[PDB]
Write an enzyme that holds these catalytic residues in place. Structure first.
Site, mmCIF file in Angstrom:
data_model
loop_
_atom_site.group_PDB
_atom_site.id
_atom_site.type_symbol
_atom_site.label_atom_id
_atom_site.label_comp_id
_atom_site.label_asym_id
_atom_site.label_seq_id
_atom_site.Cartn_x
_atom_site.Cartn_y
_atom_site.Cartn_z
ATOM 1 N N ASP A 197 27.667 -39.347 18.583
ATOM 2 C CA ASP A 197 27.453 -40.526 17.766
ATOM 3 C C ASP A 197 28.502 -41.555 18.144
ATOM 4 O O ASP A 197 29.613 -41.195 18.556
ATOM 5 C CB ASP A 197 27.574 -40.166 16.297
ATOM 6 C CG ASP A 197 26.435 -39.290 15.812
ATOM 7 O OD1 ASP A 197 25.466 -39.806 15.273
ATOM 8 O OD2 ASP A 197 26.490 -38.075 15.955
ATOM 9 N N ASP A 202 27.510 -35.132 11.310
ATOM 10 C CA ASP A 202 28.319 -34.611 10.215
ATOM 11 C C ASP A 202 27.512 -34.346 8.961
ATOM 12 O O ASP A 202 27.888 -33.553 8.088
ATOM 13 C CB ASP A 202 29.564 -35.476 9.871
ATOM 14 C CG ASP A 202 29.469 -36.679 8.937
ATOM 15 O OD1 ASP A 202 29.822 -37.779 9.346
ATOM 16 O OD2 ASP A 202 29.146 -36.534 7.760
ATOM 17 N N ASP A 206 22.119 -33.522 9.195
ATOM 18 C CA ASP A 206 22.272 -33.464 10.642
ATOM 19 C C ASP A 206 21.989 -32.066 11.167
ATOM 20 O O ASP A 206 22.171 -31.800 12.351
ATOM 21 C CB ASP A 206 23.672 -33.880 11.094
ATOM 22 C CG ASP A 206 23.813 -35.321 11.557
ATOM 23 O OD1 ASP A 206 23.296 -35.694 12.610
ATOM 24 O OD2 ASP A 206 24.494 -36.079 10.877
#
EC number: 7.2.2.10
Length: 994
Positions: free
Chosen positions: A351, A703, A707
């Protein structure tokens, strides 16, 4: 859950018939229980791995060996009882080994599930729901949501279930998506529809899920779903209640395991089946039932040799002792079997705002209008001295340091950045971290005015806490802020209203400082701030603003540009009606446009170095971002995620584009793709599946409390340091710091791990073919001894563990990074390497034709005899009714059995050159590389003395010959034929040097 995102907000009210006004009544509550459930969510369910993937295939050989051993004992004890001596104690020692197998087994399972381990719990605090079942603002608790709760997400409401925004009781709304995405960014959703039917969570940019409302946005949203029905719940438990995937090195375990088991199971049975004649004959037969069970135990010993039980416990040990010295990067090692598995990483999909963009959002550049005459503008363009949350390092004039207060325009500019800034930076000394308090946009402004230090304050002299907000609040102590009207989407600005403190100038001499999104400001800005001075909005001035937006905005240099405008003629709280969006908008003219500040999501950082190796040399880094395509393009080029000033369209695919194109072309985004813009978990999973169908096997970051199919089903969960518990509880490689080295030391140290598993698995597969062929000799022919069942296990005890770790492992081999680019397509079983395996197999084969079978002649160093003619005809010797059975059994004698065992031990050990380096043989001999082989040789030596001399073992096995040269038939094949593998490394394109 409904198309909802696509549809009218007004329709969404009607969808449950709910509002702040007509609230969720009791039978509306009931109505929804009566449809969706009530947040019944499974927990953890850490399923195991070892026995299922390994033992439960060969169980019906290796474990039932115990039963067969018992039956052979039961027979003998009724017939010639104690007299069976060697093969009497043999069933007991088989039992002892099976006990050890079970111990090694349970150790391996209690690592394999311990990899998964205590995944998922802890929902952060839900939200304030407006209701009518009690018309009271119920700060709801996870389960008691009943779709249609009118959730005021606002002050610290971690948005509960599937929500869609209805209405905002503020002009800003920023919903953080760390806890939903990994991407630790407080996103701008919006009230109104996102028309496209896309079901994914970024494209649902008005649907809310587990997002942090960061208080800036006193919103109101409808609960669109609850239960397993809820996107969050669904996407949790469809992965994180039964997690597993290919965890990269495991995919190369498949290569061997998948084939091997099936072959071994079959060939063990074949060794038994061919024996229908040769179970009847004398030393095993007579009572041919003995013969059959004897050959079954021999065939099971074959299985043990071919599928070594020690091997995965050995990797776990290598792993433990390896990892604690590897990993010079972010790697909070959550669990042991995560790492020597992680080390064949092929894609790191991180990310964006964590590591790949350091979550340290400061302003990086700005320009003010300096001075204008004849319409040409001195724009006092600047970069800012030094990245990161460092309130030190002021402002660069193109680009050399300057205390910013030396420029006239930077006064009212600093007054905007300190005042029109309701968030902050703190330096929480207690935690050692410069905390980005509130919105990152305004934290950037805080850091900016601290850097600027316009009022030349001592700053680094107050405590470093106060140093995060000192210059800021000096300005505030003069120009007393006295309300703020925050940033709306529409007017594209926010109005702070401030006059002096001490000097009673409120209402009358009361200025207003405006900050917002480019065009919406630059057109209402009817005046140009000529540093101190004011002119109208002049042409070439506005022209260079209109270059900048595309210049530092679509070039490789790309800022998240934020336009700042002062109001000079002091507005009135008396005219400022303090309600509607457009009211604010029309007050926001008389705007003396000062300039544009730009927060380029950290400059340098550092994030570029890794990405070269993470483009070519192996482990492809993908940026995952909520950024749109156009912005992400430049935003990636800025940090080398697409390397140079090369072309694009392709390099950053959006999760939208990806999903527009059906599954084939959707897949054909993924290979070597550098960035995926507008992506979240729902996209992350698809990215993995497509990466796996290129062998670009993953490590995916996240996180959030949804996810999960990006934590697993993604080879290794990289936990963001950021939001949810479930990152840090359920993801194997936890990030903590922002360092780029985290990426580089995959292509470095991860490829070392790959080499560990290489030399480790190599040794067993090349050596223990000797054990495999021993079974073939002993079982097929008339006992020309190599390895009776117990005797086999001693070679196993020599070759598993110690040599595998000896090569492995430590500095594994030479050329650690420098080794060829690990292009995700290299097998484990490389063609010419399999040729090498078969060549060593040929060697150990011939050496076992040695064993006693050849070796009772030539240069024995013991049995000065021969009848090596007879061996050929199968029915050799074996107690009297056999060909030439005058003797009892020459191979059954003390020296041959013990020595055949011993020769296999030594000949297999010779593979510790061929499997020592992969190919860099001579140059990986110097003892600063892994030379634990010394310990392995010590094992063979000590065990030699033990097995030969110490009589309790000679009862079970056979008796001592003498430590001598021994086997000058067979031993004098080993070193030359290893040299033949040297020649084989030189075959084709024949260099002859090594």
């Amino acid at each position: 859950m409904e198309a909802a995102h696509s549809k009218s907000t007004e329709e969404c009210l009607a969808y449950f018939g709910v509002s702040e006004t007509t609230g969720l009544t009791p039978d509306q509550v009931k109505r929804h229980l009566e449809k969706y459930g009530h947040n019944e969510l499974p927990a953890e369910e850490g399923k195991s791995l070892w026995e299922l993937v390994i033992e439960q295939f060969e169980d019906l050989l290796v474990r039932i060996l115990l039963l067969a051993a018992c039956i052979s004992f039961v027979l003998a004890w009724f017939e010639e009882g104690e007299e069976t001596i060697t093969a009497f104690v043999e069933p007991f020692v088989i039992l002892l080994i099976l006990i050890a197998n079970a111990i090694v087994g349970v150790w391996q399972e209690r690592n394999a599930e311990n990899a998964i381990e205590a995944l998922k719990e802890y929902e952060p605090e839900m939200g304030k729901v407006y209701r009518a079942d009690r018309k009271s603002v119920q700060r709801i608790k996870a389960r008691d949501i009943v779709p249609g709760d009118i959730v005021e997400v606002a002050v610290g409401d971690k948005v509960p279930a599937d929500i869609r925004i209805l209405s905002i009781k503020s002009t800003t709304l920023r919903v953080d998506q760390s806890i939903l995405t990994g991407e630790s960014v407080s996103v701008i959703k919006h009230t109104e529809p996102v028309p496209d039917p896309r079901a994914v969570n970024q494209d649902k940019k008005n649907m809310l899920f587990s997002g942090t409302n960061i208080a800036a946005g006193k919103a109101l949203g409808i609960v669109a779903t609850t239960g397993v029905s809820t996107e969050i719940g669904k996407i949790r438990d469809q992965m994180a209640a039964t997690e597993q995937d290919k965890t990269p090195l495991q995919q190369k375990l498949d290569e061997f395991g998948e084939q091997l088991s099936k072959v071994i199971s079959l060939i063990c049975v074949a060794v038994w089946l061919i024996n229908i004649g040769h179970f009847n004959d004398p030393v095993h037969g007579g009572s041919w039932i003995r013969g059959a069970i004897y050959y079954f135990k021999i065939a099971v010993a074959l299985a043990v040799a071919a599928i070594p039980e020690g091997l995965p416990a050995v990797i776990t040990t290598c792993l433990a002792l390896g990892t604690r010295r590897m990993a010079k990067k972010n790697a909070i090692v959550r669990s042991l079997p995560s790492v020597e598995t992680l080390g064949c990483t092929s894609v790191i999909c991180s990310d964006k705002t964590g590591t790949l963009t350091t979550n340290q959002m400061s302003v990086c550049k700005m320009f003010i209008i300096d001075k204008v005459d004849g319409d040409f503008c001195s724009l006092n363009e600047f970069s800012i001295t030094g990245s990161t949350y460092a309130p030190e390092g002021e402002v660069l004039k193109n680009d050399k340091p300057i205390r910013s207060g030396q420029f006239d325009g930077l006064v009212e500019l600093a007054t905007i950045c300190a005042l029109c800034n309701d968030s902050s930076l703190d330096f929480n000394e207690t935690k050692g971290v410069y905390e980005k308090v509130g919105e990152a946009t305004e934290t950037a402004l805080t850091t900016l005015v601290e850097k600027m230090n316009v009022f030349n304050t001592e700053v680094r002299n107050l405590s470093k806490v106060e140093r995060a907000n000192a210059c800021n609040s000096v300005i505030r102590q003069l120009m007393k802020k006295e309300f703020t009207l925050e940033f709306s989407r529409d007017r594209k600005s926010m109005s702070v209203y401030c006059s002096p403190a001490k000097s009673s100038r409120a209402a009358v001499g009361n200025k207003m400082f405006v900050k917002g999104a480019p065009e919406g400001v630059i057109d209402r800005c009817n005046y140009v701030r000529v540093g101190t001075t004011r002119v109208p909005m002049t042409g070439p001035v506005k022209e260079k603003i209109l270059s900048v937006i595309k210049e530092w905005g679509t070039g490789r240099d790309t800022l998240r540009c934020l336009a700042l405008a002062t109001r000079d003629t002091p507005p009135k709280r008396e005219e400022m009606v303090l309600d509607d969006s457009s009211r604010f908008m029309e007050y926001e003219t008389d705007l003396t446009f000062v300039g544009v500040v730009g927060m380029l999501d950290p400059p340098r950082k550092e994030v570029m170095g890794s990405i070269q190796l993470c483009r070519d040399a192996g482990i492809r880094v993908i940026m995952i971002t909520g950024d749109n395509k156009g912005t992400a393009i430049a935003i990636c080029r800025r940090i080398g995620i697409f390397g140079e000033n090369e072309e694009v369209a392709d390099r950053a695919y959006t999760g939208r584009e990806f999903d527009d194109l059906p599954l084939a072309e959707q897949r054909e985004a993924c290979r070597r793709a550098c960035c995926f813009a507008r992506v979240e978990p729902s996209h992350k999973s698809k990215i993995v599946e497509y990466l796996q169908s290129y062998d670009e096997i993953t490590a995916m970051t996240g996180d959030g409390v949804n996810d999960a199919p990006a934590l697993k089903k993604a080879e290794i969960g990289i936990a963001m340091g950021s939001g949810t518990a479930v990152a840090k509880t359920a993801s194997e490689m936890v990030l903590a710091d922002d360092n780029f080295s985290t990426i580089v030391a995959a292509v470095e140290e991860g490829r070392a791990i790959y080499n560990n598993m290489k030399q480790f698995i190599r040794y067993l597969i090349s050596s223990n073919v000797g054990e495999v062929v021993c079974i073939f000799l002993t079982a097929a022919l008339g006992l020309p001894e190599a390895l009776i069942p117990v005797q086999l296990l001693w070679v196993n005890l020599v070759t598993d563990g110690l040599p595998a770790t000896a090569l492995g492992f430590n500095p594994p081999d030479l050329d650690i990074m420098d080794r060829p680019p690990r292009s995700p397509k290299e097998p484990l079983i490389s063609g010419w390497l399999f040729f090498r395996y078969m060549a060593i197999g040929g060697y150990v084969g011939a050496a076992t034709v040695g064993a006693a079978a050849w070796w009772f002649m030539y240069a024995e160093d013991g049995p000065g005899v021969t009848y090596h003619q007879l061996t050929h005809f199968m029915q050799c010797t074996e107690d009297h009714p056999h060909f030439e059975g005058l003797d009892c059994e020459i191979f059954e004698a003390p020296e041959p059995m013990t020595m055949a065992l011993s020769v296999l031990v030594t000949i297999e050990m010779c593979n510790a050159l061929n499997s020592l380096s992969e190919n860099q043989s001579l140059m990986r001999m110097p003892p600063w590389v892994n030379i634990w082989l010394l310990g392995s040789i010590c094992l063979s030596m000590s065990l030699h003395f033990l097995i030969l001399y110490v009589d309790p073992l000679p009862m079970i096995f056979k008796l001592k010959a003498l430590d001598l040269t021994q086997w000058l038939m067979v031993l004098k094949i080993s070193l030359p034929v290893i040299g033949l593998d040297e020649i084989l490394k030189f075959i084709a394109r024949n260099y002859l040097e090594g």
